[PDB]
Structure 1
Amino acid sequence: MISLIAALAVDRVIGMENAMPWNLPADLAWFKRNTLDKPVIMGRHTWESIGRPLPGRKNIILSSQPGTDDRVTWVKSVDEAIAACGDVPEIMVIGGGRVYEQFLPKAQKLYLTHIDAEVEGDTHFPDYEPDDWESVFSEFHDADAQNSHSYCFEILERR
């Protein structure tokens, strides 16, 4: 099945690491445990800002142009992207904005981190109709030593 994973600030705003003002190791830990050993699909900008392939995951990059790095798999369409995953139980889509928009209608689960930090940004996570999803898990954490902001993890599933 297809699953989306994103970190959202107030107002579902999303942005690249360096663009984001918060510092949450715990969220990274979470992102990591939910992605390990699964194929990860991301848009070219996200790939470029990540800067190296995610270890322990098959990395598939979406780009309308030919690939420029042999350490990852390059694809040219959403359909080709899903096909390159093979038969796996769950495919994780990691952004960006444009990739989220494209895969949402096809997703069955959403792993979201809600961050309490109002930031002025460019992109918003796509709007998901409250009617189609059911929250199946949540967990709040306040800020701390390591974590700069209070955050809440949540998993939703398509009803």
Structure 2
Amino acid sequence: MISLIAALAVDRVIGMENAMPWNLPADLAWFKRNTLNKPVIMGRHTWESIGRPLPGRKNIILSSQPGTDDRVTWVKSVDEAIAACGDVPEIMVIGGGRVYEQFLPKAQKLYLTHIDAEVEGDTHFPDYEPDDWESVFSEFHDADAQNSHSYCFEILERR
């Protein structure tokens, strides 16, 4: 099974200038909780944005060019990325925009954080078709001293 996990600001913005400008520790904790001990697939720009391997996960990087770091696994196509995960229950696709576009048609589950924040951005999560997806979990949180925006954690499963 393939799942996508992402945090979306208003208008499905996910990034600006190869960064995420907000800081929501509770959402990073949710990301870790849902990805630990699973393979994670990311594109090269997201690898550079994170800037180091994510511990406790098999890190697989998509790039058309040869890899430059043997602490992670480098692959050259979608099918190779999936194969490099092996026989696991759940593969997590962690972006960015271009990568999410390619894996969306293959995904059964979306783990989305909707952040109440207006962000100028240059990268968006794919327009997906709402009729294709059933919301199976949602949990809203108001802003607090550690998290400066309200946010909603949602899990959607392909109908």
CA distance in 2, matches of 1:16, 1:88: 33
For residues 77-114 of structure 1, the C-alpha deviation after alignment (integer angstroms, 9 at most, x for no partner) is 00000000000000000000000000000000000000
Contact map agreement 2:97 2:123 (CA 8 A) in 1: yes
Between 124-133 and 30-39, report the one with greater CA deviation.
124-133
Contact map agreement 2:14 2:125 (CA 8 A) in 1: yes
Deviation for aligned residue 1:16: 5.8
For residues 18-49 of structure 1, the C-alpha deviation after alignment (integer angstroms, 9 at most, x for no partner) is 73332110000000000000000000000011
Deviation for aligned residue 1:128: 1.1
CA distance in 2, matches of 1:17, 1:28: 20
Unaligned runs of 5+ in 1: none
Contact map agreement 1:66 1:74 (CA 8 A) in 2: yes
Unaligned runs of 5+ in 2: none
TM-score, normalisation: structure 2? 0.97
Change (3 A) 1:119 1:16: closer
Contact map agreement 2:16 2:122 (CA 8 A) in 1: no
TM-score, normalisation: structure 1? 0.97
Q: Over aligned residues, Cα RMSD in angstroms?
A: 1.2
For residues 100-150 of structure 1, the C-alpha deviation after alignment (integer angstroms, 9 at most, x for no partner) is 000000000000000000111111100111111000000000100101110
How many residues are matched? 159
Contact map agreement 1:3 1:107 (CA 8 A) in 2: yes
CA distance in 2, matches of 1:84, 1:110: 21
Between 59-68 and 118-127, report the one with greater CA deviation.
118-127
Contact map agreement 1:62 1:77 (CA 8 A) in 2: yes
CA distance in 1, matches of 2:17, 2:28: 11
Change (3 A) 1:43 1:18: closer
- The structure 1 segments of at least 4 consecutive aligned residues displaced by more than 4 Å after TM superposition are none
